[PDB]
Symmetry: C3
Subunit: 256 residues, 3 copies
């Protein structure tokens, strides 16, 4: 049998066939587990939690527990997890709070290493790699193809847009734009994820153009509006710059 | 039944009828759990541990385990927990060592987020909020209504007096006075916690006076004794300044400035 | 009798008679546990894991789990643990990857405090003390008699040679030579670990000579080769300098200066 006898599952929970739940796991009220998802021993699945297919959740992970927000008064809130995610030991992912859409969602193909905290109301994209002891405060946004170094802390409401890379033991207080390389305490910005898209094999003209865009935004002393207005003609010469402009328009806490 | 069958409880432990203990929990020798206290599975309660009422302890938390002090040789030491505390996942609170009155104490209405470590012989007051991955070394003192940011580390013997606020990823090596805002590595003083007093509804005159007291202690470059003699003048016109004076007199490791 | 009924043990695993395994523990394929070893409760022993004698492993610790390397494809890899080790709660030690010898090693008399991560392919010596929330990335080397402060992070491939001491909340990107005291973010060399060799009762002449060696390497503006040839003269009048020379020759990532 794919479900271990010592596992406690609520009747209202739905588990698809071929899904493997190991010993001493707990599944809560109104939760769903997709096909081919493997829960090793000692995994907690909280109430109102949807989990996709081909997920790998290791021991001592709390998936879908109540938020830590002081104002949360036990309302109905939810957590959604996509497909093909590796969630390592001691990971804690909490459901949303009704004050902000009441949901926490994470995408696909993510790697969450040991003791990765995902607080209430967070939004995480796809192809992300969160290293050991990474703590992400509530309402944060993780884009796609993002890497965050070990023992790093993301402050509440902060945006981490696509293809960025946060160094280890970094303190993110402001919004990290796309393709940006940030590190330190307090974290500073020093260059672009050049070697990342080089190791992904992207055209060198695109890398030089994006580099000029970074120079424009950060290393040329312009305000937000003036930089944005400088990005006007480069978009059609190189389309990827769009993702950077979004970073400026979605930035409510400032920039690095 | 309020106690799950798969829970292991030693005979010497006392559990109230209103306390609920979930699956796969273990309670040690000579331990006590108060009324209306919720143990949310996979919780370890070590030997010699007293727990108050209306506490909520989440999974994988080790409450009352042996100290990590290299000199601790397995003596009889204790841990006390007050009421209305929410202790989140993976939290580790260790019992005291006989070399320092052999007890670890935490108060009431505390929020301990994921992986909050409370080392041997610590003293924690009430209404405190320790964020994720906060580790506080042995013999430290947490006052009341204190906030400590995520992934922060308090050094052993350090005092964190009332209404202070430690920023995230901060390293506290010295004593943090009352109402002080500290952050960084190494952490430094960055003004007064006017946000705490503005959400709690304090008189603007009181906040301005307390701010002037802060300027006296830190931003007036006079040593601890002259400052103290200057605050004892201000206590008449504003009583809360007392809490600051205590911070100066209770400081043994120095002051975070 | 020494093994709790609720413990799950694979048939291929070997457990000594004097080894005690508590409730709700799981032992994997082709693993071994030595004599007089204590697994308190809620301990995961992964496949292909060797554990020595007189070890004390606390709850919620994952000993021998699969690596976190993105390229690891589920091959056959191993973890080795020596004797007389105290591994505290939530500790995670992962097996090696076939791309680098395929083994993770830790020595004897080690103290791994709460939530100490030991990534794939690490090598740890003896008499080491890793404090709370210490994360050590893959392929790292920990020497002997090393202390690493709480919430510190060692980057992959970094060397932490013998008798060194890393301060709390430090970020190690480069190799720490022997006897060196490093701390900060980014960490920086801050003198010699005289406290340790004074506690261990070393001759004052030996400590003064070693300090002069530190002055040669770090505080004398000399590149690595001229420094090296200058310590090769000092190695005879005091032998311990050898351990430092190794540090320079074994450094592949540079030096924490």
């Amino acid at each position: 049998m794919t479900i271990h006898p010592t596992a406690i599952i609520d009747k209202s929970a739905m588990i698809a066939d071929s899904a493997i739940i190991g010993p001493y796991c707990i599944v809560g009220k109104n939760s769903q587990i997709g096909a081919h998802t493997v829960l090793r021993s000692h995994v907690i699945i909280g109430e109102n939690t949807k989990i996709g297919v081909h997920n790998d959740i290791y021991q001592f992970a709390s998936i879908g527990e109540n938020p830590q927000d002081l104002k949360y008064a036990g309302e109905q809130t939810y957590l959604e997890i996509g497909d093909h995610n590796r969630i390592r030991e001691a990971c804690t992912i909490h459901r949303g709070t009704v004050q902000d859409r009441g949901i926490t969602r994470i995408g696909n193909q993510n790697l969450l290493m040991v003791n990765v905290h995902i607080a209430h109301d967070c939004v995480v994209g796809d192809d992300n790699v969160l290293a050991n002891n990474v703590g992400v405060a509530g309402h944060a946004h993780i884009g796609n193809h993002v890497i965050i170094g070990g023992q790093s802390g993301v402050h509440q409401f902060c945006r981490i847009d696509d293809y960025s890379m946060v160094g280890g033991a970094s303190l993110i207080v402001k919004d990290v734009a796309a393709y940006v390389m940030a590190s330190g305490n307090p974290a500073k910005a020093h260059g672009l994820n050049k070697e990342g898209m080089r190791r992904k094999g992207w055209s060198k003209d695109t890398i030089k153009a994006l580099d000029e865009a970074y120079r424009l935004v950060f290393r040329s002393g312009l305000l937000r509006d003036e930089a944005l207005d400088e990005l006007t003609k480069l978009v059609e010469k190189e389309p990827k710059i769009q993702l950077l402009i979004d970073s400026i328009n979605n930035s409510k806490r400032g920039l690095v």
